[model samples]
Target chain A: SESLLYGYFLDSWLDGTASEELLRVAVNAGDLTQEEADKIMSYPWGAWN
Target chain B: SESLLYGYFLDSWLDGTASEELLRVAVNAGDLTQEEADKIMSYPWGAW
Candidate 1:
């Protein structure tokens, strides 16, 4: 996937440290699509395997 | 940073799921140097 940053974002969310800023970082880096970032944000933590 | 993947690698290590394989991924992807990966590995987790 082009979304190589997925692991980092997911882990941050799982650990209770994720934020909108983190999603923005991934998007700005072009490592994730807006849809992907939205999905990551909308999914409940620990349920996003 | 040219190494945009640094955050992913570091987070994985902190989560205790980091591996030599992961380091290799970053290196192979041209997102990190071997030296940088080594530094990440050698550092104690959660000490940051």
Candidate 2:
């Protein structure tokens, strides 16, 4: 169970890594947190398009 | 139930209107088709 979400990669925005600044934007926007983003990066994206 | 998915709006690309060009891109990329994009636009953006 260690894949990546296709949507995460396909998303228009640049993909965030452990140290990506955009991750901060996502966190501040009340989107994903450090923890959630990690999971997102770890899991295979189900939803796309 | 007619709002919008905050993420959809906040996404990096421009929000696709009725003739969303990106939707076509999505379709071409096999991400989503015109029909699916229409459903996505109509919905209240559940998954976000």
Candidate 3:
């Protein structure tokens, strides 16, 4: 699903197509790797938020 | 335990002791109400 989390566009981030820079900054800011972000992003808002 | 998550200090935020202003800004910025913030803040780093 193409979506954003906390304002970060997540389509490329989850699909292994994100830039290295994107992953780096994301991890630095939120401590979530692409895989972890993918799992969390897949959750429904009621289930995870 | 007293701690911080993602830079927001959690002790007061979780304990219903946060200022009304703090809760207001927090909810507006993160979309998390005080009760919800309390629950999330109570989670262990590995468990929700």
lDDT tens per residue, model 3, B9-47 = 244444443444543444544434566566655644432
**Ten residues in sequence with the least summed lDDT for candidate 2 chain B:** B1-10
Look at candidate 3 and tell me the lDDT of residue A44. 30
Q: Which scores better on TM-score, 2 or 3? A: 2
Q: What is the TM-score of each candidate against the true structure?
A: 0.44, 0.32, 0.24
> Candidate 2 lDDT, tens digit per residue, B1-48?
322223342242333232355445454544454566666566543332
Model 3 Cα lDDT, one tens digit per residue, A1-49: 2223533433353234554566567767765556644443442322111
Error of 2 at B2 (Å): 20
- Model 3 misplaced regions, further than 4 Å: A1-49, B1-10, B13-17, B37-48
TM-score of 2: 0.32
Tell me, what's the RMSD of every candidate?
A: 8.0, 10.9, 13.2
lDDT score of residue A11 within candidate 3: 32
Q: Candidate 2 docking: what grade?
A: incorrect
TM-score of 1: 0.44
Question: How many angstroms is residue B3 displaced in model 2 relative to the true structure, after the best TM-score fit?
Answer: 21
